[PDB]
PDB file of C-alpha atoms in Angstrom:
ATOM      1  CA  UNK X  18     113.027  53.352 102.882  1.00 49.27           C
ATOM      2  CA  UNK X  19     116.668  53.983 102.030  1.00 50.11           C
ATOM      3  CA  UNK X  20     116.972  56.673 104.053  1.00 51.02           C
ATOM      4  CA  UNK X  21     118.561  58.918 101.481  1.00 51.46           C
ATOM      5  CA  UNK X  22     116.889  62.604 100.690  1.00 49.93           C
ATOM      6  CA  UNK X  23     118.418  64.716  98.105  1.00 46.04           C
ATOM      7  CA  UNK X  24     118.080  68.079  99.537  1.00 47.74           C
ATOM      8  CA  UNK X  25     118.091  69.322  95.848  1.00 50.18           C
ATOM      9  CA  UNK X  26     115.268  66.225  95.460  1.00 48.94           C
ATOM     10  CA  UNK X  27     112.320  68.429  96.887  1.00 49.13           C
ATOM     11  CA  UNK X  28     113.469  72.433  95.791  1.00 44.14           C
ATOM     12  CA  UNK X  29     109.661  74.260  95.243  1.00 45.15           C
ATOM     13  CA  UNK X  30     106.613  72.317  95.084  1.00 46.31           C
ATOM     14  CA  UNK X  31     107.479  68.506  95.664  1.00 46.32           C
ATOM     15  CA  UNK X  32     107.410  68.569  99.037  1.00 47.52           C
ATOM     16  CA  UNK X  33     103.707  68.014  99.103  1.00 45.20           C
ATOM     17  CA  UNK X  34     104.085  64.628  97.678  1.00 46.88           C
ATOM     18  CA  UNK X  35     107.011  63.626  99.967  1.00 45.48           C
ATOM     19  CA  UNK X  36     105.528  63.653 103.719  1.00 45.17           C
ATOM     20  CA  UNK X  37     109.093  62.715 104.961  1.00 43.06           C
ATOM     21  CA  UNK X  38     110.705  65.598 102.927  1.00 46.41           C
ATOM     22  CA  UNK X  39     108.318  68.070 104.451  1.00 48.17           C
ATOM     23  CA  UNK X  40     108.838  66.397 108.345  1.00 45.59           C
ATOM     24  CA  UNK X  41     112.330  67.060 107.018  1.00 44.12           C
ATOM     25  CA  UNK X  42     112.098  70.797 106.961  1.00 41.52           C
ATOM     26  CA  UNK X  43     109.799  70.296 109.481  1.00 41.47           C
ATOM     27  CA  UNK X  44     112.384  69.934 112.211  1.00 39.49           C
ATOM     28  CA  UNK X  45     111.483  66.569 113.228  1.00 40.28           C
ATOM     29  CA  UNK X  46     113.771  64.011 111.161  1.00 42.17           C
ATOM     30  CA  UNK X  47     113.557  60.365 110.512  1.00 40.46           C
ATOM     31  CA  UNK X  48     116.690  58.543 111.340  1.00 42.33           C
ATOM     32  CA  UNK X  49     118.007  55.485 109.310  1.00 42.23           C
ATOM     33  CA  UNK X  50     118.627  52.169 111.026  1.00 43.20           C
ATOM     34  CA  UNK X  51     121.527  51.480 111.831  1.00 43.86           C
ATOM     35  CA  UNK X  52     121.022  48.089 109.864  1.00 47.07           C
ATOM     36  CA  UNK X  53     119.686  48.600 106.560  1.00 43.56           C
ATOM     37  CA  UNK X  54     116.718  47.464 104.457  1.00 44.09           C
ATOM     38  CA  UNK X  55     119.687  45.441 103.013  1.00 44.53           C
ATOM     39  CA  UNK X  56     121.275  44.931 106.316  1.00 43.71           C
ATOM     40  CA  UNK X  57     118.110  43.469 107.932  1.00 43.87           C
ATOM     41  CA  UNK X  58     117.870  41.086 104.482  1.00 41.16           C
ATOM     42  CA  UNK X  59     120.723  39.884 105.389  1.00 40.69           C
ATOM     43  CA  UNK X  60     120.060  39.208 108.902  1.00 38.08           C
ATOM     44  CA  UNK X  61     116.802  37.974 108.069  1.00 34.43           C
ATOM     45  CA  UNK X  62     118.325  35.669 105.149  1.00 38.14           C
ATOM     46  CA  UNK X  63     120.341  35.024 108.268  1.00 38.56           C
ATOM     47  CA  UNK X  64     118.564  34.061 110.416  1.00 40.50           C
ATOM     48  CA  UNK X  65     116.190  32.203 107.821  1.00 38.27           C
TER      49      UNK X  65
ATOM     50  CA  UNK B  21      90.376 132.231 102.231  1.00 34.95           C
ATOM     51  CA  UNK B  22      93.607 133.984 100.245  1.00 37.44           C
ATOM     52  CA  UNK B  23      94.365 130.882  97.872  1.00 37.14           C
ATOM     53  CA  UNK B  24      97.520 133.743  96.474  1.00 38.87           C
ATOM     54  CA  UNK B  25     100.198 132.531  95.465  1.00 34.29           C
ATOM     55  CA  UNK B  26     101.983 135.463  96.577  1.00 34.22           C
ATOM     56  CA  UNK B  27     101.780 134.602 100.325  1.00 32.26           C
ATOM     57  CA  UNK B  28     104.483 132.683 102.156  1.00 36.27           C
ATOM     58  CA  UNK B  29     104.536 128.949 102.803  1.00 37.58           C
ATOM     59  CA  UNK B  30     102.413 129.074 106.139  1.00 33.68           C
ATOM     60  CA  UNK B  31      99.747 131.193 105.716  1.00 31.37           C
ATOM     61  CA  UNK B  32      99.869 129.946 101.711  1.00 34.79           C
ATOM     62  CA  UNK B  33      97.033 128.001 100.240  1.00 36.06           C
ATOM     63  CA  UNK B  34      98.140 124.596 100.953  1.00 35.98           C
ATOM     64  CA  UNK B  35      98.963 121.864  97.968  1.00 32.49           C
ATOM     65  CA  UNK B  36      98.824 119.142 101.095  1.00 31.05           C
ATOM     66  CA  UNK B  37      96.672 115.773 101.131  1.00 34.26           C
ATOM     67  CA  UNK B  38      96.995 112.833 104.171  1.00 35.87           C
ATOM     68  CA  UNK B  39      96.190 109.007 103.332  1.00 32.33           C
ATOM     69  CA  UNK B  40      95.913 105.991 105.778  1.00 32.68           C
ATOM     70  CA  UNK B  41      98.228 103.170 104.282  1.00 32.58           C
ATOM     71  CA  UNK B  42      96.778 102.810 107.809  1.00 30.48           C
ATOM     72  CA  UNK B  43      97.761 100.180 110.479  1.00 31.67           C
ATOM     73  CA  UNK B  44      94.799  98.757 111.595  1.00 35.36           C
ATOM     74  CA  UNK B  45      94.580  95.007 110.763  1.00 37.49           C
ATOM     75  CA  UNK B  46      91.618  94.669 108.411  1.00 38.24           C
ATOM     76  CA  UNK B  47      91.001  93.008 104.749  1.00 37.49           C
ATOM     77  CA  UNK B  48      92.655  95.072 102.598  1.00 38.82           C
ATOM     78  CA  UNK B  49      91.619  96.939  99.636  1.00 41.82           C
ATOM     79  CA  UNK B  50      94.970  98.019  99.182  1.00 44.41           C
ATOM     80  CA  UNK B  51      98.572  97.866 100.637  1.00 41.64           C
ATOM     81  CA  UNK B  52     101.844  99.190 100.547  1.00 40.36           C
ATOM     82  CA  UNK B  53     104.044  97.816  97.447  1.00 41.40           C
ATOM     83  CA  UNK B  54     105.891  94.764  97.293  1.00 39.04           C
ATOM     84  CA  UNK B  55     109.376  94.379  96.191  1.00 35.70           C
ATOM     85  CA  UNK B  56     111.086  91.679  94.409  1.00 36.97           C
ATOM     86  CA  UNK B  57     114.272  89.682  93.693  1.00 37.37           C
ATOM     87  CA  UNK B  58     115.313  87.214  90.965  1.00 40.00           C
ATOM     88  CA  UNK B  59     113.806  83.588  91.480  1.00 37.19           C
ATOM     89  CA  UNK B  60     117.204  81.797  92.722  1.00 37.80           C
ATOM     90  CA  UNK B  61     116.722  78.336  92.213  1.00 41.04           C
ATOM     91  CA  UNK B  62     118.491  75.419  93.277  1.00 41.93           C
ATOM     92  CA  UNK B  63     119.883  76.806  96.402  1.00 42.51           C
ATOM     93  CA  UNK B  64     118.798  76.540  99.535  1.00 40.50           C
ATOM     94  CA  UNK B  65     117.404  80.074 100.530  1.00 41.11           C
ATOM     95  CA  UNK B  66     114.308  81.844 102.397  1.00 41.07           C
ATOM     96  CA  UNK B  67     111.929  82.755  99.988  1.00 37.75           C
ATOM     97  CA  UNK B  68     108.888  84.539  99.784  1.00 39.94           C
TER      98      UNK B  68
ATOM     99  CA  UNK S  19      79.400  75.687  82.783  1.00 38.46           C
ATOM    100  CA  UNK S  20      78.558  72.109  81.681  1.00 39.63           C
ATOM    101  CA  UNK S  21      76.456  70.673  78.651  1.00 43.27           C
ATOM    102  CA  UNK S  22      73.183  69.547  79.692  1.00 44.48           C
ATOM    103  CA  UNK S  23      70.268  68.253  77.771  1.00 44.29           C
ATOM    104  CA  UNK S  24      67.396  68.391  80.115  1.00 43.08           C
ATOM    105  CA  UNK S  25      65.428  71.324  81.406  1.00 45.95           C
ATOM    106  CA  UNK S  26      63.274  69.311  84.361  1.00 45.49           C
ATOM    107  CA  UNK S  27      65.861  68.095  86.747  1.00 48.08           C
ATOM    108  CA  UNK S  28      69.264  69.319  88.086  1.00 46.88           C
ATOM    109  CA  UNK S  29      71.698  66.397  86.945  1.00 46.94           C
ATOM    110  CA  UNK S  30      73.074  63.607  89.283  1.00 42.39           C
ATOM    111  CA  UNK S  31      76.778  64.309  88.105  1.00 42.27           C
ATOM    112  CA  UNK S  32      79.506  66.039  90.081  1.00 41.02           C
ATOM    113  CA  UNK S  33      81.495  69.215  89.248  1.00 41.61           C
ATOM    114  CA  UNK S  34      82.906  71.750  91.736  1.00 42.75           C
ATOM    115  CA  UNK S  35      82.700  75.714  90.833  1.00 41.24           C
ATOM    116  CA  UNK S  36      85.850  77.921  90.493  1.00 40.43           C
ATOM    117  CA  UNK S  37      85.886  81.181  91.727  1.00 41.27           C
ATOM    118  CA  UNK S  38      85.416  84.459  89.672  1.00 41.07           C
ATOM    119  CA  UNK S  39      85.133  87.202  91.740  1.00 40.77           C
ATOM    120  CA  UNK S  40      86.973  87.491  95.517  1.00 38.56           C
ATOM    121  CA  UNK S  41      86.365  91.176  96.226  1.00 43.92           C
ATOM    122  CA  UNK S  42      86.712  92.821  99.380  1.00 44.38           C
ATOM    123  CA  UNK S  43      83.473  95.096  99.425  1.00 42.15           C
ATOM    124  CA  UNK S  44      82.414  94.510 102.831  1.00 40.71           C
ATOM    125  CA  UNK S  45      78.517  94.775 102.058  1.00 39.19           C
ATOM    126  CA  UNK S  46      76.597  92.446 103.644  1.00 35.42           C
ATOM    127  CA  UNK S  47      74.074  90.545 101.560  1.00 35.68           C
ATOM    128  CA  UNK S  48      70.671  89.551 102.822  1.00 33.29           C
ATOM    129  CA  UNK S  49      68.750  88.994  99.979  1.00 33.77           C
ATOM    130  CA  UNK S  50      68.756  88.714  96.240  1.00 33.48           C
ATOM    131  CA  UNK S  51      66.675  89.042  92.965  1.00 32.78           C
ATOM    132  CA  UNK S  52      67.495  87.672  89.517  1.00 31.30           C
ATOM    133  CA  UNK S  53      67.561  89.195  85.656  1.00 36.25           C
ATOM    134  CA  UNK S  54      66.264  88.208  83.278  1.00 34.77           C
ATOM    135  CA  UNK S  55      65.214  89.646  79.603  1.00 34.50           C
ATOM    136  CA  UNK S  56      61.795  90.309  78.799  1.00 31.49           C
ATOM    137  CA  UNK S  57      60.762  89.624  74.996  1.00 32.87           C
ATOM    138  CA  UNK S  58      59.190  92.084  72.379  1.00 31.65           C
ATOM    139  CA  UNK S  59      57.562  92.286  69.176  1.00 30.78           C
ATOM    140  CA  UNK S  60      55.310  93.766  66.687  1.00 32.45           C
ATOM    141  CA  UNK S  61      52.460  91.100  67.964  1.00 35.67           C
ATOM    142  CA  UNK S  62      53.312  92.216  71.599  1.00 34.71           C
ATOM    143  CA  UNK S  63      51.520  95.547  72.753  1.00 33.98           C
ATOM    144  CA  UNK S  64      54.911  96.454  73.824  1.00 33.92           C
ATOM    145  CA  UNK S  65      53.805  98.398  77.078  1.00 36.47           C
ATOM    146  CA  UNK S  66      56.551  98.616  79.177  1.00 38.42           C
TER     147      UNK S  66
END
């Protein structure tokens, strides 16, 4: 969620724990949406 | 035969051995020597 | 290596091994025998 990686974030190790980090490196990426986690909130609140 | 010393280089007793490093894949008991570098964190670089 | 306190009966407790010894000898093992010490004193004959 909050499709932000710091590339610095993994450097190592830490990889292992972040699955998305090593799809990252992996060549196959995760995209954000184009609305948010916030974004869909909002929608949702407006909607709701 | 004549080990001399005297004698020229071909005919010469030989100081010569011959080792496999040998090519063959195989478990090894021992291989060629690794080199290093200096552990450059924080970048993004191929490693080994 | 654990603690134990009973001689009968291998404990119902769980602990993996760590390895030792990863040599590449190459000899293949069949079969086995153990070692073990063999006591002596004055009120043994002491025959080998």
């Amino acid at each position: 969620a909050g499709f932000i990686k710091q590339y610095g974030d993994c450097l190592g190790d830490i990889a292992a724990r972040d699955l998305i980090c090593a799809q990252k490196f992996n060549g196959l990426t995760v995209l954000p949406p184009l609305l948010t986690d916030e974004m869909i909130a909002q929608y949702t609140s407006a909607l709701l | 035969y004549g080990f001399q010393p005297t004698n020229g280089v071909g005919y010469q007793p030989y100081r010569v051995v011959v080792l496999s490093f040998e090519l063959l894949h195989a478990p090894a008991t021992v291989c060629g020597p690794k080199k290093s570098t200096n552990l450059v964190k924080n970048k993004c670089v191929n490693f080994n | 290596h654990t603690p134990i306190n009973l001689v009968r009966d291998l404990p119902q407790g769980f602990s993996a091994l760590e390895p030792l010894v990863d040599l590449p000898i190459g000899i293949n093992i069949t079969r086995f025998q153990t070692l073990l010490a063999l006591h002596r004193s004055y009120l043994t004959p002491g025959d080998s």
